[PDB]
Amino acid sequence: LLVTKRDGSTERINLDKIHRVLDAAAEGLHNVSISQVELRSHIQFYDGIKTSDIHETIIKAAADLISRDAPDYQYLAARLAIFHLRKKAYGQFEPPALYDHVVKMVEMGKYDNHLLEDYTEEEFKQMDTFIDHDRDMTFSYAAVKQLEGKYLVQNRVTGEIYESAQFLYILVAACLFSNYPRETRLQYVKRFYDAVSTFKISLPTPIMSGVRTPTRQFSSCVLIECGDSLDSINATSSAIVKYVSQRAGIGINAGRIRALGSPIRGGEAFHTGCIPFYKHFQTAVKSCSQGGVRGGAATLFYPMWHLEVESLLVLKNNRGVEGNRVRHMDYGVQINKLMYTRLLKGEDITLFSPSDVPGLYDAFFADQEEFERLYTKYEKDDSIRKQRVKAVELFSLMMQERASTGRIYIQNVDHCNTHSPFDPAIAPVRQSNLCLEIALPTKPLNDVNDENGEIALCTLSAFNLGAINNLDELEELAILAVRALDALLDYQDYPIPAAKRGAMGRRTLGIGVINFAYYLAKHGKRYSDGSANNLTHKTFEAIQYYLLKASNELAKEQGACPWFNETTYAKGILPIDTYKKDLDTIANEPLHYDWEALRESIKTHGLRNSTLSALMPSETSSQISNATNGIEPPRGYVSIKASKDGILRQVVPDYEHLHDAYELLWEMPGNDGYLQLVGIMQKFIDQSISANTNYDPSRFPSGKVPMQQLLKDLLTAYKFGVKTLYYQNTRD
Amino acid sequence: NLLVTKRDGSTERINLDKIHRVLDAAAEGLHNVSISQVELRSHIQFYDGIKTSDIHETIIKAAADLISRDAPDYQYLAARLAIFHLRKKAYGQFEPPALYDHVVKMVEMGKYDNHLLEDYTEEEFKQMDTFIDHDRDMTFSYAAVKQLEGKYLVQNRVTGEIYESAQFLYILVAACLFSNYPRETRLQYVKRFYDAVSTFKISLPTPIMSGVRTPTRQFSSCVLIECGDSLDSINATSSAIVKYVSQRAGIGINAGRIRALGSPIRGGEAFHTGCIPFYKHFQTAVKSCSQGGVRGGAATLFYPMWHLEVESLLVLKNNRGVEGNRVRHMDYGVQINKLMYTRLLKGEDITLFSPSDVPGLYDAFFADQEEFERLYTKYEKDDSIRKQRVKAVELFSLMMQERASTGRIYIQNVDHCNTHSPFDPAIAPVRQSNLCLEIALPTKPLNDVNDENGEIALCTLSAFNLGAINNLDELEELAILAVRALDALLDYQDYPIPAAKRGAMGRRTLGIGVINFAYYLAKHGKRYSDGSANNLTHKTFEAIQYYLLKASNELAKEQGACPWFNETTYAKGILPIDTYKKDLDTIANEPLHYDWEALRESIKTHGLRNSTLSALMPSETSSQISNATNGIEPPRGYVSIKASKDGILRQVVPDYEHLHDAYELLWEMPGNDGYLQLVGIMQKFIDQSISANTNYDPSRFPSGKVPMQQLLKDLLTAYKFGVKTLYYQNTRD
Ligand SMILES: Nc1nc2c(ncn2[C@@H]2O[C@H](COP(=O)(O)OP(=O)(O)OP(=O)(O)O)[C@@H](O)[C@H]2O)c(=O)[nH]1
Ligand SMILES: Nc1nc2c(ncn2[C@@H]2O[C@H](COP(=O)(O)OP(=O)(O)OP(=O)(O)O)[C@@H](O)[C@H]2O)c(=O)[nH]1
Ligand SMILES: Nc1ncnc2c1ncn2[C@H]1C[C@H](O)[C@@H](COP(=O)(O)OP(=O)(O)OP(=O)(O)O)O1
Ligand SMILES: Nc1ncnc2c1ncn2[C@H]1C[C@H](O)[C@@H](COP(=O)(O)OP(=O)(O)OP(=O)(O)O)O1
Ligand SMILES: Nc1ncnc2c1ncn2[C@H]1C[C@H](O)[C@@H](COP(=O)(O)OP(=O)(O)OP(=O)(O)O)O1
Ligand SMILES: Nc1ncnc2c1ncn2[C@H]1C[C@H](O)[C@@H](COP(=O)(O)OP(=O)(O)OP(=O)(O)O)O1
Ligand SMILES: [Mg+2]
Ligand SMILES: [Mg+2]
Ligand SMILES: [Mg+2]
Ligand SMILES: [Mg+2]
């Protein structure tokens, strides 16, 4: 009959105090039972119970009641969690003054001191009025767990929470626009805060947990190209180590490395194979990882016509010996038009070493016409070392390993340059990143501190389609998103001189979208029927237009990027000009915006950023806005994920009214409907799209997916101009 | 009635007299050889239409199979037969062409360096041709010629064409090394050095034999790299390794400075992930240039025993465990000092520290044993410093256990490597070794692959053939030839890394060893285990070090001492005879036979051209050329059998006919106590270290298993007599 207070005092138990708290968390909720929570909670009560354990008891009780029938329990248990977190950080419900909060935290060394230098005490009072702490009640239960675990500033030793959700949002906006003139500074701070607090703009994990702290490591996407020399490989290795220490994803292009047996220095020595060097890359990636599990991940890229391509495709399978296996990395095979042609004609594919075929590698990315000329020229030459393999067998081996592992990716390099914001003659795209959504120009290094090399970096973000009521809201959101990320480029640090060159030179951005599945449900569309084709075209048009429009107006203000002349935009080329013309057979939606006026505006003033749009996967940042993971359809109406505090349940947004409007992953007939949508997106997307292929063994005879079906969807994707292919999800 | 096929494609009646004529020429001066026996086994294999080249290779293989204990001279019969065919492959006839005519032809083909025709005139080539005695090719053993044809002789690696003979190799190596010498003495040094290597007095390493005359400049075969505790250093070390394993060099890695798992980074901004993930990155850097990750570059990694993760690093080679905590394709050397052995004898505990948490403990561990014991006990009594306690008996047992199972877990006594060292521990201490643990040179970590402040230790090797000399005073002539040649190579070879060039040009370190030591003891009727060779060893290695120092000292008078000579103990007038382990006086009473005091005053005044000179390395390739016993190690058998591409190669111990009972085989030895004592005596004069092997026969022990008590016994026995390092532990199966 007694409870233990926080200070150590004791008082008789009061069920009215508990009932009073539950009522505050149930405001506006439907199908929620206060008594049901108390039933599951009172039975757990014991004499001498800590008051903190009481609160965590009713939280877990409400969290277990999260179901399809009553989705509003995800908000009930969330608000209960918010209440407890307020006490842990402030000792009371209402947060202290913003200025008083910052000053205390700066002394503790949790916030950066530059906040008090760029902003006066009076300006902090003004920004405090912008804050609406009641927006913390809009978080889902899964969202709060992500906040407490990853985003919120806390003591990693004791577990003490030091801040709340709204202080995070308002200070991220403060830091990014800290260098803006006072005339417009506080105005941008409020507008950007309202965007992120109302879940209109989703920010990556390193940004949410970083941009207010003394740290300056915000790079989470790294692309490195390796040259064919010991000096380049050593430089690449050192470059990887530097970035995996900052927990960044690495994209390695090691296609230039010559094949096994190739002569060195005219025959003074002979090559020992690419595999020993791939192992050296892997250990460089896993150098700062406890053991050899999880940690830094990396994706290695190589052309299909490589001589050792038969050896590189089978690096991930569990069989075989360690001598011919490099399992802890992902791989992406680079394919162009000529390869698919040999597949359709059922002819042969000739394998060459990039050191034996002059200019063949360069043409493979920049000029498909020149490539076919050089490829056929070297095929008829008998002096050049080569190997013949049937196109049907080669493609079968690739898709076979892609089926078993699910981590063998495909990049159509010809589409990555014919439909690209970059000039293939000046700065071609030869690779991608970890999740294959980034397509940026790269240049190999001869040293770790080489100032002539170019390491591609990219800052990410995402639009929440479920938080907007119409497409014309994107005009405001684009201005906020572009200006914020562009400011971060001058805010973050660069451990490698070559990486800073690429970042400052092109100022590349990559903004994507989340809650696409819920976005289709609101408009009553689906994936596999192709009923969302015209809607998709209308949607992503408004995205790309307003992004370019935002960057263009920014270029008028602060000037275009230094390396803008290396872009196609400088020559007046728009994404609507170089898209795959096969898309016209599956979409007839007209353009709703003035691209012609934008074209002349870009030709004149330029763009602040070389790239702007890129569709990345979001598993962490999506749960914050309670959104569907990126563009992928949900596997179930309620996702179940075990955690440290128990089982976390997350319900799809507005399940109450759209339970039949949703289309689950395994309710889909095939991938043809999905790929068509991806291709339409690619028409406006500057870079690439992390598209997943899905297969259900039960939907096929003998419980096995036929090879003919794999090649069918593969050719289908290429037909509609799909640049890259990510995961291949196989149902168990 | 049978016919053979000539080289041109012609055909001729079989002629057994032509074959018998060849065999007689190859059997001149040989004993207990039967020509008819060879012809009996050869004629039966003959078929109609046989190529004349197949005929020659048939009588060679026939004579090679007759190599036995009863008739050891068959190793010279088959050898001379092999020489005959090699003469035909390169010259098209028996007698080699003129030296000048040969060089010109080879330079045009791009097989020889063009600088030979630039540094020497046609007249000077004619003079050097007179030095050449092509009849010395008949002094090679069968195993030697096979090594020549395979590794040393300049050849086309594609077609397999041989382009030269044995004598042209020797005379041109001498020509290149002494090419920069003044004309007044140049050709004089060329002849003397040629006579030394052709008569097998001086043995040269593989990269020198196969390199010094060709356009290449890669002769570095020994690399020592120290890794610092930073991302910049590890990346630099990794890049440094790759460049040298590409040149097929042995690597010595010092990664003891790397902080332990859990250690805070930048005040706690991040936490360390362990030394093991970085050791894996080193291994792939080592095996980067290997056709599979096997044959290529090997490396030995070093770490102190008092390291915090020493329990995890000791078990990296065993077949057990998962890949997450195993790095099997590298060798390891545990660094031990006096204080560690002290805790072992008293049966106390050893405290484990992270080198980042104990200021100056790492430096004192090598430079100051007195300061170390002060700091070690001081930090042991501190409770604020993170530590772990383990029993000394358990820790040493774990080390020797892995050394027993793998045989590649090595031991380096760091205190002996600095108290008895040619270097000042306060200025340039020795913190590591190389692949075979015979090299002990100062090193400094790099912050970049092209750092000019770092120091990568390189060393050029060589060996004296004790079985080829008649007396120890012959070493005086051989030392002058050996030292001057290797010192000239230092300015001849290239350096892919600036830090390596600094160490090479700064100290000019050399490492000359010995071969045919087992045969050397047999001639004097001595043995290993009885300690009857103790006084002989003391006399022998004294003459070695003395003549080496004397040669380098007079060279310093001629061309100046090394730039970093002031950092040596020799500069302060300290000799190896001053800092040796005083426990050696109980096992050897042989007096000094040379004037060390006159040498002492000569070094203080003029200095030494080289910081180091003596180092006993293992020799398996260079030894077979001189038909010598492998280094200082005793032979496992009277006749060694080793399979090859052309069949089974048999090699008989030198002068088996007269010394069959004088020899003491490896497994005929009672224990290691006799062997270690000899090694300890050698260390008294040797500048660097000695690749000493420990041997154990399970059959000589009860229950067929070697006890832990015996392993620790020999370990303490070795340390007692000042043994610096321990190499292989050969266990008979
Ligand atoms: N929604 C809401 N929650 C509040 C408010 N005031 C406090 N809380 C939260 O409700 C919980 C209990 O608050 P208290 O005011 O201390 O009430 P109590 O613990 O039942 O009673 P006391 O013995 O007076 O402390 C804590 O998690 C507070 O953060 C409020 O005005 N609104
Ligand atoms: N030791 C020695 N070997 C010789 C001499 N002359 C030739 N040889 C070697 O003996 C082998 C046979 O030499 P040839 O002169 O060609 O004699 P042949 O092959 O029996 O006769 P032909 O049919 O005339 O060639 C070759 O390996 C020669 O190198 C010599 O004077 N001394
Ligand atoms: N006397 C009580 N009996 C039962 N439950 C109580 C009692 N007082 C508070 N609770 C409930 C209310 C919340 O759901 C939960 C946590 O309350 P909380 O306010 O954080 O602790 P506290 O009241 O002991 O400290 P504080 O002095 O900081 O308010 O406990
Ligand atoms: N010793 C070696 N063993 C195996 N592979 C090697 C070796 N040396 C270099 N390689 C690899 C690394 C590179 O991929 C390639 C050689 O390229 P590089 O380092 O630029 O040498 P190089 O410039 O001297 O000669 P090349 O004219 O052939 O490029 O072969
Ligand atoms: N007619 C022969 N019948 C049998 N053996 C022969 C005959 N002629 C030479 N031999 C032996 C001598 C050697 O042991 C071996 C190789 O002879 P070799 O001289 O190298 O080849 P070759 O005589 O066919 O060509 P070349 O014209 O270059 O001398 O064959
Ligand atoms: N993110 C990381 N994860 C794991 N290990 C790391 C990481 N960063 C560095 N290390 C390793 C490399 C070094 O051995 C050690 C840190 O030393 P160093 O690279 O010099 O960093 P530092 O100079 O910035 O800080 P410190 O003051 O700790 O030396 O830990
Ligand atoms: Mg309370
Ligand atoms: Mg090159
Ligand atoms: Mg002949
Ligand atoms: Mg540091």
PDB file of N, CA, C and O in Angstrom, chain A residues 230-231 234 237-238 241-242 245 272 276-277 279-280 283-284 287-290 322 328 447 449, chain B residues 231-232 235 238-239 242-243 246 273 277-278 280-281 284-285 288-291 323 329 448:
ATOM      1  N   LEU A 230      49.583   0.577 -56.995  1.00  0.00           N
ATOM      2  CA  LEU A 230      49.806   0.347 -55.573  1.00  0.00           C
ATOM      3  C   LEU A 230      49.595   1.625 -54.772  1.00  0.00           C
ATOM      4  O   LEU A 230      49.066   1.594 -53.661  1.00  0.00           O
ATOM      5  N   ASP A 231      50.008   2.749 -55.348  1.00  0.00           N
ATOM      6  CA  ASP A 231      49.866   4.043 -54.693  1.00  0.00           C
ATOM      7  C   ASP A 231      48.398   4.421 -54.538  1.00  0.00           C
ATOM      8  O   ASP A 231      48.012   5.053 -53.555  1.00  0.00           O
ATOM      9  N   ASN A 234      46.708   1.876 -51.864  1.00  0.00           N
ATOM     10  CA  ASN A 234      47.113   2.301 -50.529  1.00  0.00           C
ATOM     11  C   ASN A 234      46.401   3.579 -50.101  1.00  0.00           C
ATOM     12  O   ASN A 234      46.028   3.735 -48.938  1.00  0.00           O
ATOM     13  N   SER A 237      42.756   2.617 -49.447  1.00  0.00           N
ATOM     14  CA  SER A 237      42.691   1.927 -48.164  1.00  0.00           C
ATOM     15  C   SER A 237      42.729   2.907 -46.998  1.00  0.00           C
ATOM     16  O   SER A 237      41.947   2.790 -46.054  1.00  0.00           O
ATOM     17  N   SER A 238      43.639   3.874 -47.069  1.00  0.00           N
ATOM     18  CA  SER A 238      43.762   4.889 -46.030  1.00  0.00           C
ATOM     19  C   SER A 238      42.525   5.778 -45.985  1.00  0.00           C
ATOM     20  O   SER A 238      42.107   6.226 -44.917  1.00  0.00           O
ATOM     21  N   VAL A 241      39.592   3.820 -44.185  1.00  0.00           N
ATOM     22  CA  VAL A 241      39.810   3.784 -42.743  1.00  0.00           C
ATOM     23  C   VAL A 241      39.414   5.108 -42.090  1.00  0.00           C
ATOM     24  O   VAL A 241      38.814   5.127 -41.014  1.00  0.00           O
ATOM     25  N   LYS A 242      39.739   6.210 -42.755  1.00  0.00           N
ATOM     26  CA  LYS A 242      39.428   7.537 -42.236  1.00  0.00           C
ATOM     27  C   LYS A 242      37.925   7.786 -42.124  1.00  0.00           C
ATOM     28  O   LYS A 242      37.477   8.511 -41.237  1.00  0.00           O
ATOM     29  N   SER A 245      35.826   5.219 -39.617  1.00  0.00           N
ATOM     30  CA  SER A 245      36.022   5.635 -38.236  1.00  0.00           C
ATOM     31  C   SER A 245      34.952   6.648 -37.846  1.00  0.00           C
ATOM     32  O   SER A 245      34.655   6.834 -36.666  1.00  0.00           O
ATOM     33  N   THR A 272      48.681 -10.715 -59.259  1.00  0.00           N
ATOM     34  CA  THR A 272      48.317 -11.850 -58.417  1.00  0.00           C
ATOM     35  C   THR A 272      46.808 -11.972 -58.224  1.00  0.00           C
ATOM     36  O   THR A 272      46.339 -12.837 -57.484  1.00  0.00           O
ATOM     37  N   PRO A 276      42.978 -10.694 -53.753  1.00  0.00           N
ATOM     38  CA  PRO A 276      43.788 -10.309 -52.588  1.00  0.00           C
ATOM     39  C   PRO A 276      43.655  -8.833 -52.209  1.00  0.00           C
ATOM     40  O   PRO A 276      43.812  -8.488 -51.037  1.00  0.00           O
ATOM     41  N   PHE A 277      43.371  -7.979 -53.187  1.00  0.00           N
ATOM     42  CA  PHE A 277      43.208  -6.552 -52.927  1.00  0.00           C
ATOM     43  C   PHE A 277      41.813  -6.234 -52.396  1.00  0.00           C
ATOM     44  O   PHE A 277      41.627  -5.248 -51.683  1.00  0.00           O
ATOM     45  N   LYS A 279      40.252  -8.202 -50.336  1.00  0.00           N
ATOM     46  CA  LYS A 279      40.374  -8.566 -48.930  1.00  0.00           C
ATOM     47  C   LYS A 279      40.984  -7.419 -48.134  1.00  0.00           C
ATOM     48  O   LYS A 279      40.579  -7.152 -47.002  1.00  0.00           O
ATOM     49  N   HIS A 280      41.957  -6.744 -48.737  1.00  0.00           N
ATOM     50  CA  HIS A 280      42.620  -5.616 -48.093  1.00  0.00           C
ATOM     51  C   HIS A 280      41.651  -4.455 -47.908  1.00  0.00           C
ATOM     52  O   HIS A 280      41.756  -3.690 -46.950  1.00  0.00           O
ATOM     53  N   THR A 283      39.145  -5.440 -44.839  1.00  0.00           N
ATOM     54  CA  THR A 283      39.738  -5.236 -43.522  1.00  0.00           C
ATOM     55  C   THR A 283      39.893  -3.749 -43.220  1.00  0.00           C
ATOM     56  O   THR A 283      39.895  -3.341 -42.060  1.00  0.00           O
ATOM     57  N   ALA A 284      40.027  -2.945 -44.270  1.00  0.00           N
ATOM     58  CA  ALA A 284      40.070  -1.495 -44.118  1.00  0.00           C
ATOM     59  C   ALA A 284      38.700  -0.964 -43.709  1.00  0.00           C
ATOM     60  O   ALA A 284      38.597   0.002 -42.953  1.00  0.00           O
ATOM     61  N   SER A 287      37.975  -2.208 -40.117  1.00  0.00           N
ATOM     62  CA  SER A 287      39.103  -1.866 -39.254  1.00  0.00           C
ATOM     63  C   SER A 287      38.649  -1.299 -37.914  1.00  0.00           C
ATOM     64  O   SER A 287      39.268  -1.560 -36.882  1.00  0.00           O
ATOM     65  N   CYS A 288      37.570  -0.522 -37.931  1.00  0.00           N
ATOM     66  CA  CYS A 288      37.065   0.086 -36.707  1.00  0.00           C
ATOM     67  C   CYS A 288      35.757  -0.559 -36.266  1.00  0.00           C
ATOM     68  O   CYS A 288      34.849   0.119 -35.787  1.00  0.00           O
ATOM     69  N   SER A 289      35.669  -1.874 -36.434  1.00  0.00           N
ATOM     70  CA  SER A 289      34.485  -2.623 -36.032  1.00  0.00           C
ATOM     71  C   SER A 289      34.858  -3.717 -35.038  1.00  0.00           C
ATOM     72  O   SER A 289      35.748  -4.524 -35.310  1.00  0.00           O
ATOM     73  N   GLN A 290      34.196  -3.725 -33.884  1.00  0.00           N
ATOM     74  CA  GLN A 290      34.411  -4.769 -32.886  1.00  0.00           C
ATOM     75  C   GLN A 290      34.205  -6.149 -33.503  1.00  0.00           C
ATOM     76  O   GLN A 290      33.072  -6.596 -33.686  1.00  0.00           O
ATOM     77  N   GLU A 322      38.211 -19.860 -48.012  1.00  0.00           N
ATOM     78  CA  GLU A 322      38.481 -18.452 -47.743  1.00  0.00           C
ATOM     79  C   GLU A 322      39.339 -17.819 -48.834  1.00  0.00           C
ATOM     80  O   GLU A 322      39.347 -16.599 -48.996  1.00  0.00           O
ATOM     81  N   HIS A 328      32.053 -10.339 -46.425  1.00  0.00           N
ATOM     82  CA  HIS A 328      31.557  -9.248 -45.589  1.00  0.00           C
ATOM     83  C   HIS A 328      31.445  -7.913 -46.324  1.00  0.00           C
ATOM     84  O   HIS A 328      31.464  -6.852 -45.700  1.00  0.00           O
ATOM     85  N   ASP A 447      47.426   9.520 -53.500  1.00  0.00           N
ATOM     86  CA  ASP A 447      47.834   9.627 -52.106  1.00  0.00           C
ATOM     87  C   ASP A 447      46.612   9.969 -51.258  1.00  0.00           C
ATOM     88  O   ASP A 447      45.627  10.501 -51.769  1.00  0.00           O
ATOM     89  N   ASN A 449      46.277  12.228 -49.154  1.00  0.00           N
ATOM     90  CA  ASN A 449      46.114  13.673 -49.072  1.00  0.00           C
ATOM     91  C   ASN A 449      46.256  14.347 -50.432  1.00  0.00           C
ATOM     92  O   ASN A 449      46.641  15.513 -50.517  1.00  0.00           O
TER      93      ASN A 449
ATOM     94  N   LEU B 231      45.567   6.568 -36.370  1.00  0.00           N
ATOM     95  CA  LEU B 231      45.032   6.197 -37.676  1.00  0.00           C
ATOM     96  C   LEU B 231      46.012   6.552 -38.787  1.00  0.00           C
ATOM     97  O   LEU B 231      46.145   5.821 -39.770  1.00  0.00           O
ATOM     98  N   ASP B 232      46.695   7.679 -38.624  1.00  0.00           N
ATOM     99  CA  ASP B 232      47.663   8.141 -39.608  1.00  0.00           C
ATOM    100  C   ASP B 232      48.861   7.200 -39.698  1.00  0.00           C
ATOM    101  O   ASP B 232      49.418   6.992 -40.777  1.00  0.00           O
ATOM    102  N   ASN B 235      47.614   3.590 -41.210  1.00  0.00           N
ATOM    103  CA  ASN B 235      47.458   3.742 -42.652  1.00  0.00           C
ATOM    104  C   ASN B 235      48.807   3.836 -43.351  1.00  0.00           C
ATOM    105  O   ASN B 235      48.992   3.292 -44.440  1.00  0.00           O
ATOM    106  N   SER B 238      50.437   0.336 -43.153  1.00  0.00           N
ATOM    107  CA  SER B 238      49.775  -0.526 -44.124  1.00  0.00           C
ATOM    108  C   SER B 238      50.286  -0.259 -45.535  1.00  0.00           C
ATOM    109  O   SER B 238      50.575  -1.190 -46.286  1.00  0.00           O
ATOM    110  N   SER B 239      50.396   1.017 -45.890  1.00  0.00           N
ATOM    111  CA  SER B 239      50.903   1.407 -47.200  1.00  0.00           C
ATOM    112  C   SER B 239      52.374   1.039 -47.352  1.00  0.00           C
ATOM    113  O   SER B 239      52.828   0.686 -48.441  1.00  0.00           O
ATOM    114  N   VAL B 242      52.680  -2.887 -48.054  1.00  0.00           N
ATOM    115  CA  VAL B 242      52.286  -3.247 -49.413  1.00  0.00           C
ATOM    116  C   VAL B 242      53.396  -2.999 -50.431  1.00  0.00           C
ATOM    117  O   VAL B 242      53.640  -3.825 -51.311  1.00  0.00           O
ATOM    118  N   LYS B 243      54.079  -1.867 -50.299  1.00  0.00           N
ATOM    119  CA  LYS B 243      55.156  -1.523 -51.220  1.00  0.00           C
ATOM    120  C   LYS B 243      56.344  -2.476 -51.126  1.00  0.00           C
ATOM    121  O   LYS B 243      57.042  -2.697 -52.116  1.00  0.00           O
ATOM    122  N   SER B 246      55.540  -6.245 -52.189  1.00  0.00           N
ATOM    123  CA  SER B 246      55.493  -6.266 -53.644  1.00  0.00           C
ATOM    124  C   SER B 246      56.890  -6.510 -54.203  1.00  0.00           C
ATOM    125  O   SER B 246      57.050  -6.965 -55.336  1.00  0.00           O
ATOM    126  N   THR B 273      38.371  -0.363 -30.705  1.00  0.00           N
ATOM    127  CA  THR B 273      37.674  -1.580 -31.105  1.00  0.00           C
ATOM    128  C   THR B 273      38.567  -2.817 -31.025  1.00  0.00           C
ATOM    129  O   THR B 273      38.154  -3.915 -31.401  1.00  0.00           O
ATOM    130  N   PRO B 277      41.403  -6.198 -34.960  1.00  0.00           N
ATOM    131  CA  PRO B 277      40.928  -5.727 -36.269  1.00  0.00           C
ATOM    132  C   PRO B 277      42.005  -5.016 -37.089  1.00  0.00           C
ATOM    133  O   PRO B 277      41.953  -5.037 -38.318  1.00  0.00           O
ATOM    134  N   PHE B 278      42.965  -4.393 -36.413  1.00  0.00           N
ATOM    135  CA  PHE B 278      44.052  -3.708 -37.101  1.00  0.00           C
ATOM    136  C   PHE B 278      45.144  -4.685 -37.523  1.00  0.00           C
ATOM    137  O   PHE B 278      45.865  -4.441 -38.491  1.00  0.00           O
ATOM    138  N   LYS B 280      44.486  -7.685 -38.602  1.00  0.00           N
ATOM    139  CA  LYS B 280      43.931  -8.277 -39.814  1.00  0.00           C
ATOM    140  C   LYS B 280      44.214  -7.404 -41.029  1.00  0.00           C
ATOM    141  O   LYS B 280      44.494  -7.909 -42.116  1.00  0.00           O
ATOM    142  N   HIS B 281      44.135  -6.091 -40.836  1.00  0.00           N
ATOM    143  CA  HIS B 281      44.401  -5.142 -41.910  1.00  0.00           C
ATOM    144  C   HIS B 281      45.864  -5.192 -42.326  1.00  0.00           C
ATOM    145  O   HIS B 281      46.198  -4.957 -43.488  1.00  0.00           O
ATOM    146  N   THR B 284      46.433  -8.557 -44.569  1.00  0.00           N
ATOM    147  CA  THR B 284      45.994  -8.425 -45.953  1.00  0.00           C
ATOM    148  C   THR B 284      46.928  -7.505 -46.731  1.00  0.00           C
ATOM    149  O   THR B 284      47.064  -7.628 -47.947  1.00  0.00           O
ATOM    150  N   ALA B 285      47.568  -6.580 -46.020  1.00  0.00           N
ATOM    151  CA  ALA B 285      48.579  -5.722 -46.623  1.00  0.00           C
ATOM    152  C   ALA B 285      49.818  -6.547 -46.946  1.00  0.00           C
ATOM    153  O   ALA B 285      50.506  -6.298 -47.935  1.00  0.00           O
ATOM    154  N   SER B 288      48.869  -9.066 -49.833  1.00  0.00           N
ATOM    155  CA  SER B 288      48.249  -8.355 -50.948  1.00  0.00           C
ATOM    156  C   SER B 288      48.827  -8.787 -52.293  1.00  0.00           C
ATOM    157  O   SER B 288      48.114  -8.839 -53.295  1.00  0.00           O
ATOM    158  N   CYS B 289      50.121  -9.091 -52.310  1.00  0.00           N
ATOM    159  CA  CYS B 289      50.799  -9.470 -53.545  1.00  0.00           C
ATOM    160  C   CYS B 289      51.143 -10.955 -53.594  1.00  0.00           C
ATOM    161  O   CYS B 289      52.226 -11.332 -54.044  1.00  0.00           O
ATOM    162  N   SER B 290      50.225 -11.794 -53.130  1.00  0.00           N
ATOM    163  CA  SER B 290      50.450 -13.233 -53.143  1.00  0.00           C
ATOM    164  C   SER B 290      49.380 -13.951 -53.966  1.00  0.00           C
ATOM    165  O   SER B 290      48.185 -13.797 -53.715  1.00  0.00           O
ATOM    166  N   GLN B 291      49.822 -14.729 -54.952  1.00  0.00           N
ATOM    167  CA  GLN B 291      48.942 -15.543 -55.794  1.00  0.00           C
ATOM    168  C   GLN B 291      48.062 -16.502 -54.980  1.00  0.00           C
ATOM    169  O   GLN B 291      48.134 -17.720 -55.157  1.00  0.00           O
ATOM    170  N   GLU B 323      36.852 -16.845 -36.890  1.00  0.00           N
ATOM    171  CA  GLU B 323      37.662 -15.915 -37.673  1.00  0.00           C
ATOM    172  C   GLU B 323      37.749 -14.544 -37.009  1.00  0.00           C
ATOM    173  O   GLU B 323      38.671 -13.776 -37.279  1.00  0.00           O
ATOM    174  N   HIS B 329      47.734 -16.282 -40.530  1.00  0.00           N
ATOM    175  CA  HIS B 329      48.730 -16.241 -41.597  1.00  0.00           C
ATOM    176  C   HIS B 329      49.882 -15.280 -41.316  1.00  0.00           C
ATOM    177  O   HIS B 329      50.544 -14.809 -42.240  1.00  0.00           O
ATOM    178  N   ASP B 448      52.966   9.260 -42.064  1.00  0.00           N
ATOM    179  CA  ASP B 448      52.567   9.197 -43.463  1.00  0.00           C
ATOM    180  C   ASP B 448      53.521   8.264 -44.201  1.00  0.00           C
ATOM    181  O   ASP B 448      54.639   8.029 -43.744  1.00  0.00           O
TER     182      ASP B 448
END
